[model samples]
Target chain A: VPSWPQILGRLTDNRDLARGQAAWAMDQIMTGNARPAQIAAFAVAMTMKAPTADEVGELAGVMLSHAHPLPADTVPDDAVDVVGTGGDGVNTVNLSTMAAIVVAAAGVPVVKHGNRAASSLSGGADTLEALGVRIDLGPDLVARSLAEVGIGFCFAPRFHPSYRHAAAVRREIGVPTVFNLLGPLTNPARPRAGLIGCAFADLAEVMAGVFAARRSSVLVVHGDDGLDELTTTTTSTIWRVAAGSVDKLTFDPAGFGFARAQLDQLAGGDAQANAAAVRAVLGGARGPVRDAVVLNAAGAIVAHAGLSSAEWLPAWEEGLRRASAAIDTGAAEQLLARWVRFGRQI
Target chain B: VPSWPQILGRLTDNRDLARGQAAWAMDQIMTGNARPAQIAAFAVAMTMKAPTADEVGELAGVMLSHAHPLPADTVPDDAVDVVGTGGDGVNTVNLSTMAAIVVAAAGVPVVKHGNRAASSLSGGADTLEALGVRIDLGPDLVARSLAEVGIGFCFAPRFHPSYRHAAAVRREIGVPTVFNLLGPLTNPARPRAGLIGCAFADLAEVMAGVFAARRSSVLVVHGDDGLDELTTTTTSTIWRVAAGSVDKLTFDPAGFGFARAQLDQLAGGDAQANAAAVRAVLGGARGPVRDAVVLNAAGAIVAHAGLSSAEWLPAWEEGLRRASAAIDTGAAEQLLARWVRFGRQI
Candidate 1:
């Protein structure tokens, strides 16, 4: 086995060495074999050096290998995930999670994966739990939920216990590292397509390249206003990844029928309070929070439907119509009620 | 108490954070309280980031506090040391130890603190032990040696048992870090003045500034050709550090009355072979090896005598005569016999 110091030496010395060693180190991290500080240092050093697309892709592949994929029998082959790297430091509400539910309501399959808030006010788990969803289901239950509920929330810790081993290291470092970027890329469901939201603009193209190499039909998103999810406040940058290449796209809130929002108006509260906002938004509430959720949902729907156009503007317009109809007709709210009802039965 | 992750985050995030946390972390390393990878990461991260003068100085101070200083009652106030950081990747013979002996015989009080070969063919302790000298003497014996014999070899592991705690971490890291530079700066005798040879040229000014701030009379040397000592092979950069200022100087062997020699001719051998070299040099053998010993000895003597001119050519000339005379007359060899005799008595 490659030693920690040896891996660390290579990581600090050369880019190719970093790529190979990071792949091995990520395996070690997933298996809970690496030391906390070494992992944190490797992550920081990798961040300081700016990891290449190859290094991040190698790390994501290792994490994926150790993940529990959704049962092939139950989950659809075209299932998509909508998730974010989450340390945006914006404290925004769970737009992607709400958007995932909206996408599912708009005739798309979603295996939504997320975690407890690493740096945000509320994580997908905390808010979903607040909304009374039973996210701690076993593999069979999770597969069943995805097959029957149109959407399933894979609480990160339960589905990928191996990746969860990095929790303490991540908490201690207190900054975004490659580990922060790996989450959205290593969906345990092994979704064929995804809307992966990133906090930093530079990482969007990098992740898109990684997704392209992995044969993942994915769209990586970064908002100009520093939000992880697609933002209504500013232009959002998008990278649509195919089997071998990535095409860039941009979406202005105005062009998509979203009047720009002041970020403060879309800020998240505690889990319960955020759940109330999600309830209101899905109940056809009008405001920035609702508009932002609908816009992000549109992106997810476009990601799920497939990227036929290089620009994908018309695809997003189609997604917008379907997502807005789901919200306006109260279908998204009814889906949440069903999940909460399922949680009560569990 | 600061956590390792917290310290690491600060180290990778800000320069000032690195300065403060590096100090705290060094204390933890020496005391054996820090975990292996934690210390290694801190050390490696600091090295990769290029430690500042203040960070290195603070680390030296903390290491000093934990070191067993020679008894002041026996060690004279004017003692000097000749040492180096020793990861030059050049396995050169123990020229500094031989030079220290010459300086002591030339009427300078000497306390040569060093360890066995950390990354060299033979360290001071290894070669000295091969020459039948007891390097593990207690503080009292070491101080008494400085008082009576005009010299003392403070074997680093004995004088600073605390630093020995990092042996495992250093071994694991396999590459030099800031810990390698601490030995020369943290003389347990707390000598008044010293000559320190560093492998890297960039560290000369930084180390000199640190010595200046700490009120140390010191000269930091780096040979342009990669030798840690005063090189007869190429022009050597020197930084003269006084109470509050540092001045730069360059020395060429030809200007100092010696012809240039290739560094390969001055390379070191095993412990026994290096011990034989020490005997040959001090026994009046003349060549690149002997010339290297005398040249570095001249530097130690000049450092002990004090910095008069920014150029200090006259001082080096004076030092050259004294050091050369001591070796030619066999006085330095006679001193080595006494140390060996003392080891027998113990």
Candidate 2:
């Protein structure tokens, strides 16, 4: 058994030791050998000290180890995942989930991993289920969906038994800790590209560093309006990870002829309301919500294409046009129909 | 129920809130409402942040609250306690226990509350029991001993039943935490004066501050040689608390015609061997162990008399003379014989 006290001491004493112990603690917590209170304490204690990106990466690695890997049977090329580390508590519509479908409809495979709501009114998985999209597809069918229709949803609980181990902790401790930051980073498929959202702006930079070391391309964003997804309410801080370095970028919807919007205008309610909001945005709806989804989808497209090291505005504008075209031509709606057909069978 | 996450957040964010939460956590821990891991984590986490004296005092107060108080039915006058926070791990003879008896033999009531060793081979209660003194005497007899013979030993397990609630945490996480700093501070008899020794010099001041607010007079000591007791090995750092403020003092055995001695000379053995060592010191054995007992007894005398802010060298010199006279004149030995007689009757 790892000496937790010694591990706890290492958390504040040395960087390398901290990473190893964090990894070990995560492993123990997921596998059910660690106590629930100890796991909660470890998370809370680490949060107060502010874990380093490398340390968080080590824990993410452990979560991935305990995860059921997605089947890799000749799936679609240049695949990417889009997700948010939910707990924003803003009750916003599932923008990242909508963006992932938009990007997939625009011709890249989207391997989206998500969970039910923990703090928000509707989480990505909850909204997907409510929208008549199946979430319990087995690994083979999930892979087939990626290869054939270009979209797949990896429901977090189905793939990560670790969540079962942590279910009690999630219910008991309402405040967010490092676990809130790990979900988008530890996708079962380990997709080559991703667009991740964080509730805090500073976390975007740390998350970008975590992905920069491994992924071909990734983008982490945080809106100043307290939404995890790209927002029309305020400038969203974006950290772009490409090649071997991470860089900062900014997003403002006014640049796309959409005036700055209020957070209340995009407020979401129950699963039913959020599902309706998703359809409205995808069916060429006008205004802030539509533009927010467009920007997030545009970022996902840039990530999926592995474009790097320059002003991404040109590619982003092109991606936005393609994403808008997908909705206008009804191709995105057709893809959603196909998704419902494949997932409902499972 | 306490919002533990918010309380945990307060642990690093705000000092006043931290103190309140710490007090609450300690109350929960003592009342058996907290899980062992959480209790241990609270201790380890707070230690890493380095708890303030007032914060520690807040927790200590909780322990004192749940403590089974000693009966206050008119027993002894001018009572004092002599003890240590015993994680020094050096396994020395029980100098403070012997000193209590010596101080009492010189005619002041000494109410000693102690336990069997947690880290050492023999704790004060264990050695005293082995020396033919009964450790399980009820409160009335214990009070009578103080009133009639001027000395009594209160076995910790008999008085601190709340510790049973924390026993599992003690076994699981052996590293010293705030609980280790609390035992001497919460003497069951609630003595009017105390002479406490800590393993760390820094704790001397913190503990002194704790006592200065309540007790009329108290002395907290830490030996420079890593021993907890007032050592013959080196000068002992002293924080003397009197009249609501603590003052720093020094205890060098050389000032009393004793040479600096090595720790090994005062090393303790098993319960039987340590019991013999205590007898040898009280019988005026000429060695380092005897000198160690004399110095501790002298410090207890100053505290018991409620000595104030001044050079205590002259008073300690006089106290030392009386303590030695108690041994040489067979007063302490006579008390030991009577203790054996009473214990045998029980």
Candidate 3:
């Protein structure tokens, strides 16, 4: 929280200047030390006053400054991290995690900046643990995992200790605040590309803007029912920030050869349940579960390939069909076996 | 802290609603409970959305329901409680406390709600302590003090225990929040009429509006520099709300027979210094301090008299003159003597 004079000084003098200060302020708002008034003024005023691109960028700078920035120098520059702006609470079977398995099976590189469960029933770490894959390891071992089997997951809490300041506010607020967005935004691995989600349609564009301003290629998603992405069985809205500009498109189940499904049908019951579903999908399962697994896998392929061409949709469609065909072919299963077998050594 | 979804639900679904929810939401925003995104949405979208009167009324109900309501129901309705929004942070002597001495000297009932130092060194309780007045009195003695001396000080902290819920947030944020306004608005004594100060010019009207909505008659003042009416050495903006109508008037020092002075001149150097200043003013010392006292006394008269009629100013002027004359007439000394004589009785 900031002083009224401080917050008002920003808006009263010139409304736009707050973007920078607010960006900086967000880094400190959750410190549990801000006065109720200062806290209220900063939050209420900033919310009323939309934050600017410069403010968002400046905040991105604050998050990075407070965080230990580690370069993924070990992995190929093309290695991409797949994660959502969590707060969706849908508990899907770690779609991105499963996609990592299919991607590695298809011979694509993956360096995932991941964390434990939040919002959803289970997170990447839980799913990996359920699948009998080791999660707690040093940076060098993760790099080796990427080098050996083309997949590595960096549990973010262990990786970014400096987030305590941001975490302080997040905890005191007792629910999702802006810290939710910054979690994915401040990935320590600093992957060159990302897939982010926003619960609101407007944030889809905003997240894309932040990613774009941060000098990264990103695809932001907001599902029509206010989920972060197109519900695997329902429609998902996509906003892309690449090269220089941003645009949106709707992705569909039928378009990806998936049967129509309710948003909840894709729900993963728990971390262990998620791991089971992932195993089943990669182990030749059929119907909505199999369809969502393959459809999500294709989205990752587009994210990794930077397929922003006018032929992007066609490529994405063909990519899903191919990934789906491979899902039942035991190819994804072989990749998981490699993870389970060699994950210890890696 | 409410979610953006909850805030938006209030906004779009109730287009005909008033800003009361927004204002209450404003409290959470200031208190650091609401997210910046949520705060921004309430202020902007709600402002654009336009709130209905019923919505505005409901907001007042919600704020009262959630806030620390004062606990002075047992005090008589004849008493006057003088307090300000306290966001003024003016370094002036405790003029309300001084005026109470004179009002009580004349046998007019008074119960002044005050607190220890916050945001400034010379808050009312702080200065009163400097004057050797014991603020530790319980409710029964409070009633006795009002009856015997026509004056009582109801320390705010003792009366409003529920404020603890947001205390940490308020203290950290530092400056005054909506609580500052609500403090005077919900005095433990619940004085039938009150003379309060506004830290901002617009607040003069906002407070008047709140009082009118709550069906109370109140005199609200805001200095051009935002001093709340205490330091009338500067140009002070004043508003009076009664019988459902609210009006504003300006009080110029020269017109009030007090020469204009700078802000720092009236500051209470410390609690002792403030107590000395209050004693000097009540003891008939003439200067900007006394001039401010006289003008604020006029505001009290207007608030308590339930009118801004021509006679109100003259009556208030006479109240100050009589008090000033009586200060040295040995009557004031005797009153001070009796206060000290009370000992534990105080």
The candidate that achieves the highest DockQ relative to the unseen native structure: 1
Instruction: Give the Å error, residue B243, model 1.
Output: 5.1
Give the number of the best model, judged by TM-score. 1
Write candidate 3's Cα lDDT for B1-346 as tens digits: 5455556545544354334445566456545566543443343334334444344444445444544433455566656667776666666777777666665565556778778767677787877776777786767777676666667777766665544544444554443434445566656666777778767564467667777776676778777877876455567676767787778777665765666678777777788888778777766777777767666665675566663334656756765566566565655555655654553564
Candidate 3 per-residue lDDT, tens place, A1-346, comes to: 5444565446432376644566556555433344333443453334334555566566666666655444447867666666776667566767767776776676667777777876578887899988988787567777777788778777777666655544543444333433456666766667766666676564556667777765566678777776664466568888777776687777676754556787677777788788888888887877666666676666666666673333577757766766776676788898778878877654
Segments of candidate 1 deviating more than 4 angstroms: A1-7, A10-19, A28-38, A164-166, A307-311, A343-346, B1-41, B159-167, B307-311
Task: Give the alpha carbon lDDT tens digit for every residue of B229-311 in model 2.
Answer: 88899888888888889888776889789888888998899999998898787777898888889889988988876743345
Query: How good is the docking of model 3, by CAPRI class?
Result: incorrect
Ranking by TM-score: 1, 2, 3
How much lDDT does each candidate structure score?
A: 0.80, 0.78, 0.63
Question: What tens-digit string does per-residue lDDT give for candidate 2 at A1-346?
Answer: 5676666545533234533777888888888887665675566567656777788888888898988887655445478888988877788888898888888889878899888998677888889999899888767778887877789888888888766756667555555667788889888877878888998665677788889878458888888787888788878888888886888877776787667888888778889999998888777788878778888888888887674333577777787888888878877878888888877766
Report clash pairs, candidate 1: none
How many residue pairs of model 1 clash at the backbone? Answer: 0
